[PDB]
Amino acid sequence: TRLKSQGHRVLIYSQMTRMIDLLEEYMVYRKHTYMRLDGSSKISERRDMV
DNA sequence: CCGAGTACATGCACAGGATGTATATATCTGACACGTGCCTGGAGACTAGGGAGTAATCCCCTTGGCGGTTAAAA
């Protein structure tokens, strides 16, 4: 929220995938758009997201 | 000479990730699907005629039922 008045880029590094899923479920209710990068999605979807 | 301990090696377990799998979906197309009238081979109704098998007896063989003997089953 302090960075919201700033408006820079924020990246989250999580070792556990379940914490990334819970981070997407928690960030979805905050109306904050983001994307998840893991070893799950195909290189095409990761290439489009990148 | 023996015991304690530190160090190196190792093995097992967990988590990530890649690849195989299977179903959900999309779409244009051969083929079921559906009128439109034809008609001619069928399908049935209506008299008349035929006929073979059902039904009842009844005579007559072929079954099913008695006691031993050894031969085959055990």
Swiss-Prot record:
This is Chromatin-remodeling ATPase INO80. The DBINO region is involved in binding to DNA. The lineage of its organism: Eukaryota, Metazoa, Chordata, Craniata, Vertebrata. Belongs to the SNF2/RAD54 helicase family. It is found in: Cytoplasm; Nucleus; Cytoplasm, Cytoskeleton, Spindle; Chromosome. The chain holds residues 1111 to 1160 of 1556 of the full protein. ATPase component of the chromatin remodeling INO80 complex which is involved in transcriptional regulation, DNA replication and DNA repair. Binds DNA. As part of the INO80 complex, remodels chromatin by shifting nucleosomes. Regulates transcription upon recruitment by YY1 to YY1-activated genes, where it acts as an essential coactivator. Involved in UV-damage excision DNA repair. The contribution to DNA double-strand break repair appears to be largely indirect through transcriptional regulation. Involved in DNA replication. Component of the chromatin remodeling INO80 complex; three different complex modules assemble on different domains of INO80. Interacts with DDB1. Interacts with transcriptional repressor protein YY1; the interaction recruits the INO80 complex to YY1 target genes. Interacts with YY1AP1. Interacts with tubulin alpha. The gene is INO80. Disulfide bonds: none annotated.
